[PDB]
Nucleic acid binder design. Structure first.
Lengths: 106, 187, 128, 147, 104, 53
RNA sequence: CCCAUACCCGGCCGUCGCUGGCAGUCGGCAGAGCGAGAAAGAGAGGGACGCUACGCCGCGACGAGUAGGAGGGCCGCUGCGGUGAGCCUUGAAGCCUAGGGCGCGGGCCCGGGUGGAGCCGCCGCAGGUGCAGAUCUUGGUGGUAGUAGCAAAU
RNA sequence: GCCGGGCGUGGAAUGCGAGUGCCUAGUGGGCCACUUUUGGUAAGCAGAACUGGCGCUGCGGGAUGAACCGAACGCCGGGU
C-alpha cells in the first residue's frame, strides 16, 4: 500500500509482471527499491510524454528556421505580466455594484 | 541576526604537511612558490599531494608504472609520483624510464638505472620541467590497503561482502549461525 | 628629557578593570583569578543583566599597540650586560627591564651601559 | 605523554567528558561480552555474524606440522634463483634448462598464478597444481616431483 | 512511573539537517533481479560479439566514406554601435587613430 | 558493552594475575652472570673446546 | 515623540573564506612596471622598510550555547637531557604589599618590605601536574558566648 | 546487447560549489504553544499529528515570570 500512487520506471519484464524501481522515503532517507507488480496494477505515466512531445517541436523548430535564420524561442517561460491594452466601453457605461442589505435567512 | 549555518564553513583540508621533515618542508617551500606564480595547474596537484598523509600517497609498484607507460600517447614523458616507487619482482623486463619520485627503494634504483633509466627528485624536476610539461602524473592504488576490506556496509547484512574483524580464522570463528542456512539464517 | 619612542600612538583599551572570578568577593577561599563558571544555573555563565562580565576575545587590544607600555615602549627582561647588546637596534621601540634577582652591584653595571647605547630602562634606580 | 592526553583539557569541566544525565557508572551493560544473545543481540548479529553455534568436525590432537605446505606462485618462481642463472639460460643456445628446486628455497607446492617468461625450466617441487604444470609445459619446462 | 509512549516531534527537523538526499543516480545500473532466461541469453550475445567484428569495421569504413563524398559534393542606433566599435580594444585600434591627428 | 564495530576480545585477566607478574629487570644482570660463568668455565678446561663435546 | 545586544555607518578583536598576495631586496653586469572590462610577448633575428616563508601582507563575510567534540596556549606545577661564558651572601626560594605596569584570559613582570641559600629562561622529555563543593580527609579557627551552666541527699 | 556516425539555443523560474569515506562522543526521563485531535464533567489532567519554541538563551516589552510579543548576543561610538 505504500506504493499506491507512486511512480517508478520499469527495469525487468516477466510473463505477467514487471519490475519497477520506485523511490520510497524511509525516515529521512530515500530508497530506490525494486518491486514486482502484476500488470493489472500498472499504467503508463503521461507525465513524461509532454516532455517527449515538447522535444519534437524543439527538434522541429531547430532544423526549421535554421536555414531561415530566424531565432525562435525554445525554452518555456513562466506566464509573463500581461501587456497594456485598451478596454472599449462602446455605448454602455459600467453598471454600478452596491452591497445588498442583510436579511435573516433562517 | 543572519539566517545561515556555520556548521561547515571551515573546510577540512591540509594546508601544510603534518610532518616536520625538513627536506619535505623545503620541497613545499619550492612548490608553494611554483604553484603560486605559475599558471601551470600541474604544480597545484603536486603541491596538494605533498601535504597528504602517508596512507593517502600509497606506494607505486614498479610494474604499475611500467604498465601505465606502455600506453600509446607516451614513451617519452616523465613519470612523476609523489609517493614511493617500490620494486616489483613479478616483472621481468624493464624499459628505460624517466622517474621523479619522493623515495625509491634500494632494489628499484638498481633495477631502473640498470636499464639505462634515470631517477629524478622533485628539486631536479622543477629545473627540468617547471610547469610540468611532458610529464605523466601517476598514483599508487589508494584503496589497496587491507583496511578497506573492512569498510562499507557491515557484515551480517544482505550482500555486504565485507571482511569482519576476527582474532583468527578457522572453522570455529564466525562460521556458525549468521553464515549457514543450516544454523538460523544467512546473508 | 628621557628617551622618546619612535612613535607615540594613542593607546586605547577596551576595558581597564580586571575580570574577577564569580563570587570571589563573597569568599576568601575563592581567589580573584578568573575561572569560567560552568554551573548549570549560573547567572554569570548565561549573561544575565547586571552580573560579572565574562572575558571574550572581543576585548582584545589593538594589535598595533598591544603589549605597549604607557611610555610607548615594549618591555624586555635582561639579566646581564650581554643581553643589552641585542637591543642595540631595537632602540626606539623596546625598553630594557633589569630582572628582580640581579644583584645591586651588577645593576650599576647595566644602567650606565644602557645609557651609552641609549636604551631606555624602566627601573633604572632600583636598589641604590 | 600525559601532557598531550585529553584529561589535561578536561580539568575544570565537571562531568569530565561523560555527561551529566548518563553518569559514567561502573558497568552499565554488563562485563565483557555479556548479553551477546539478549541485549547486545543487534551488535553481535550486525558485526559478528556466525559467532554463535557449532560447525564442522573436531580434530582432537592437531599437529600443525603435518599440514605444513607453503606454496609459491609461478609469477615469482624465478625469484628463487639468482638473476645470473635466469640470464645465462636465455643467453644459452644449447637449450639446457636451469633447475629451480623450490623445496630448497622453502616451499612445497607450486601454484600457477602468474605468467612465465618464455624459457625452459626444471621445477623440482613436492606438489603441483594443474595450471602450474600446464603453464610450465607451455613454456617448455618439466615438472619433477620429489619427496 | 509511566512515560511518553511514542512521538515523531523532532524527527522531521533531524532528517533535514543533513538533507533527505535522493539515491545516488548512476548510468549503467546493475542487472541484479532480471529474468534469468533473459540474462542468460544476453550474456551469449556478448560472448559472440567479436564474431562479427570484421563485418563491423568493413561496414564502418564505408559508412564514414559515405558521408565523406557527401559533404565534399557540397564543399539599437548606429551612433552607439559606431562608438562601441571604436571602444573595442582589439578591432578598434585602426579606428581610434584619427584621434591622434585630431588634437594635432 | 561492545561499541559499533570491533573484535570479540577475550583477555585472560580474570584470575589474580597481578600477584604473579614476572618482570625482567634482572635480564641484563642475568646476561652478565651467564657470560661470566661461561668464561669461568672456559678457563677451567682451558685447552679443551669451550663449546663442549 | 521614547528605546533592544535587532537594522544602518564607523573603529577594534577573533574566526572562517579567498585552498588570496610576497623569493622581484631582479641597482653604472643598474633602469625604478604588471589596477588591466575583452584567448595571448614592455621577446629576439647614490637609492627607507621588509621575507622568525611555522613569516609578513590585502580583501570580504561572520561571532548565542548546556551535554559533547576539537584546536591553540610566550598559561601554570614537579623532575630529566641539552642550552643560556644565565642569576645569587653587594641577598636565592618563600611570604607581605593603599606601589608601577602587561595580557581578552589562564597568568606574568617590575618597585618596596621581610627572609637567609639556593634558583630560573629557552629547545626537547616525563608525570602521583592545577580544586569551592564530595553529610570529602587531616589540622586550625570563629559566631553562638563571657551564654547554658557550676541547684539530689537540712 | 554491442559498435559507428550526426546533432549544443545546455531546452521552466529562483537560489546555491558539490561529492564521498573513515573514526566518533553525548543522548535514548522531556516540556510548552497556534491549528487538528482521543479518553475525561473537568484539570496547570492523560495521549497523539503538524510546525515553532523552552530545554541549550541572554536582550527590549508583558509590573512580576523557563515557553507569550519583538528580536537572537564579539568589544564600542553615532543614527534609526
Amino acid at each position: 500500500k505504500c506504493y499506491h500512487g507512486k511512480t517508478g520506471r520499469v527495469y525487468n519484464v516477466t510473463q505477467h509482471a514487471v519490475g519497477i524501481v520506485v523511490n520510497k522515503q524511509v525516515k529521512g532517507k530515500i530508497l530506490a527499491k525494486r518491486i514486482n507488480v502484476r500488470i493489472e496494477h500498472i499504467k503508463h505515466s503521461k507525465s513524461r510524454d509532454s516532455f517527449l512531445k515538447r522535444v519534437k517541436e524543439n527538434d522541429q523548430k531547430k532544423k526549421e528556421a535554421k536555414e531561415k535564420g530566424t531565432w525562435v524561442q525554445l525554452k518555456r517561460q513562466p506566464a509573463p505580466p500581461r501587456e497594456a491594452h485598451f478596454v472599449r466601453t462602446n455605448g454602455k457605461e459600467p453598471e454600478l455594484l452596491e452591497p445588498i442589505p442583510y436579511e435573516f435567512m433562517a | 541576526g543572519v539566517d545561515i549555518r556555520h556548521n561547515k564553513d571551515r573546510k577540512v583540508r591540509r594546508k601544510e604537511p603534518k610532518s616536520q621533515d625538513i627536506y619535505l618542508r623545503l620541497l613545499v617551500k619550492l612548490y608553494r612558490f611554483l604553484a603560486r606564480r605559475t599558471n601551470s595547474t600541474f604544480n597545484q596537484v603536486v603541491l596538494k599531494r605533498l601535504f597528504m598523509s602517508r596512507t593517502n600517497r600509497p606506494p607505486l609498484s614498479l610494474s604499475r608504472m611500467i604498465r601505465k607507460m606502455k600506453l600509446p600517447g607516451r614513451e617519452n614523458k616523465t613519470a612523476v609520483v609523489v609517493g614511493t616507487v617500490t620494486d616489483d619482482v613479478r616483472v621481468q623486463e624493464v624499459p628505460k624510464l624517466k622517474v621523479c619520485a619522493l623515495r625509491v627503494t634500494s632494489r628499484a634504483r638498481s633495477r631502473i638505472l640498470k636499464a639505462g633509466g634515470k631517477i629524478l627528485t622533485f628539486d631536479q624536476l622543477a629545473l627540468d620541467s617547471p610547469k610540468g610539461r611532458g610529464t605523466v602524473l601517476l598514483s599508487g592504488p589508494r584503496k589497496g590497503r587491507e583496511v578497506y576490506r573492512h569498510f562499507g556496509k557491515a557484515p551480517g547484512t544482505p550482500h555486504s561482502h565485507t571482511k569482519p574483524y576476527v582474532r583468527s580464522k578457522g572453522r570455529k570463528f564466525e562460521r556458525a549461525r549468521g553464515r549457514r542456512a543450516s544454523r538460523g539464517y544467512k546473508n | 628629557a628621557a628617551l622618546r619612542p619612535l612613535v607615540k600612538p594613542k593607546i586605547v583599551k577596551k576595558r581597564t578593570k580586571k575580570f574577577i572570578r564569580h563570587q570571589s568577593d563573597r569568599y576568601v577561599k575563592i581567589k580573584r583569578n578568573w575561572r569560567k563558571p560552568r554551573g548549570i544555573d549560573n547567572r554569570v555563565r548565561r549573561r544575565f543583566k547586571g552580573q560579572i562580565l565574562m572575558p571574550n576575545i572581543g576585548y582584545g587590544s589593538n594589535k598595533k599597540t598591544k603589549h605597549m607600555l604607557p611610555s610607548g615602549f615594549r618591555k624586555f627582561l635582561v639579566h646581564n650586560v650581554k643581553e643589552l647588546e641585542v637591543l642595540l637596534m631595537c632602540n626606539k621601540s623596546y625598553c630594557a627591564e633589569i630582572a628582580h634577582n640581579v644583584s645591586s652591584k651588577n645593576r650599576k653595571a647595566i644602567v650606565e651601559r644602557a645609557a651609552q647605547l641609549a636604551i631606555r630602562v624602566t627601573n633604572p634606580n632600583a636598589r641604590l | 605523554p600525559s601532557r598531550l592526553r585529553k584529561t589535561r583539557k578536561l580539568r575544570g569541566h565537571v562531568s569530565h567528558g561523560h555527561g551529566r544525565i548518563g553518569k559514567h557508572r561502573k558497568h552499565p551493560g554488563g562485563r565483557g561480552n555479556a548479553g551477546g544473545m539478549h541485549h547486545h543481540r543487534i551488535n553481535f548479529d550486525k558485526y559478528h555474524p556466525g559467532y554463535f553455534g557449532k560447525v564442522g568436525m573436531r580434530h582432537y590432537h592437531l599437529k600443525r606440522n603435518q599440514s605444513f605446505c607453503p606454496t609459491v606462485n609461478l609469477d615469482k618462481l624465478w625469484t628463487l634463483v639468482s638473476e645470473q642463472t635466469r640470464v645465462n639460460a636465455a643467453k644459452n643456445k644449447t637449450g639446457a634448462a636451469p633447475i629451480i628446486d623450490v623445496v630448497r628455497s622453502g616451499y612445497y607446492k607450486v601454484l600457477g598464478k602468474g605468467k612465465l617468461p618464455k624459457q625452459p625450466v626444471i621445477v623440482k617441487a613436492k606438489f603441483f597444481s594443474r595450471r602450474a604444470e600446464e603453464k610450465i609445459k607451455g613454456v617448455g619446462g618439466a615438472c619433477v616431483l620429489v619427496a | 512511573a509511566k512515560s511518553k509512549n511514542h512521538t515523531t516531534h523532532n524527527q522531521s527537523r533531524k532528517w533535514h539537517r543533513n538533507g533527505i538526499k535522493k539515491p545516488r543516480s548512476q548510468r549503467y545500473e546493475s542487472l541484479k533481479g532480471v529474468d534469468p532466461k533473459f540474462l542468460r541469453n544476453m550474456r551469449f550475445a556478448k560472448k559472440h560479439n567479436k564474431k562479427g567484428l570484421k563485418k563491423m569495421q568493413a561496414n564502418n569504413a564505408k559508412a564514414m566514406a559515405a558521408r565523406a563524398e557527401a559533404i565534399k559534393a557540397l564543399v539599437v542606433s548606429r551612433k552607439l554601435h559606431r562608438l562601441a566599435y571604436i571602444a573595442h580594444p582589439k578591432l578598434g585600434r585602426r579606428a581610434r587613430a584619427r584621434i591622434a591627428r585630431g588634437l594635432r | 558493552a561492545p561499541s559499533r564495530n570491533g573484535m570479540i576480545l577475550k583477555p585472560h585477566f580474570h584470575k589474580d594475575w597481578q600477584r604473579r607478574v614476572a618482570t625482567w629487570f634482572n635480564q641484563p644482570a642475568r646476561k652478565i652472570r651467564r657470560r661470566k660463568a661461561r668464561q669461568a668455565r672456559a678457563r677451567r678446561i682451558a685447552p679443551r673446546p669451550a663449546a663442549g663435546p
